[PDB]
């Protein structure tokens, strides 16, 4: 019975880890887009005139 119990535990924990990883990937992509915008804004609105 221990194999069955630990199998249930493992599958549940793996699903939770999958969810966390996917959320982290989405947030990282959005932050990367925002930082690209910030880099362009800093490069063009400081070292020159807009």
């Amino acid at each position: 019975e221990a194999e069955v119990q630990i199998d249930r535990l493992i599958t549940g924990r793996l699903q939770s880890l999958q969810t966390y990883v996917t959320q982290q990937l989405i947030r990282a992509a959005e932050i990367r887009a925002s930082a690209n915008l910030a880099a362009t804004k800093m490069s063009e609105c400081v070292l020159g005139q807009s």
């Binding site: 490069s43 063009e44 070292l47």
Partner: protein
């Protein structure tokens, strides 16, 4: 006209080139050099003008 968007320094033109799964740009840029120092003044008034 926007600075440092394509190329570094002042921009003149660019040339595109193909790639396996992309594109390659060759930017031509103008850069000053061999500077000298001088004394300046805002505006010069002659005969009161």
């Amino acid at each position: 006209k926007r600075v440092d968007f394509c190329g570094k320094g002042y921009h003149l033109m660019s040339f595109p080139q193909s790639a396996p799964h992309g594109v390659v740009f060759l930017h031509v840029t103008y850069v000053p050099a061999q500077e000298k120092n001088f004394t300046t003044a805002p505006a010069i008034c002659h005969d009161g003008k």
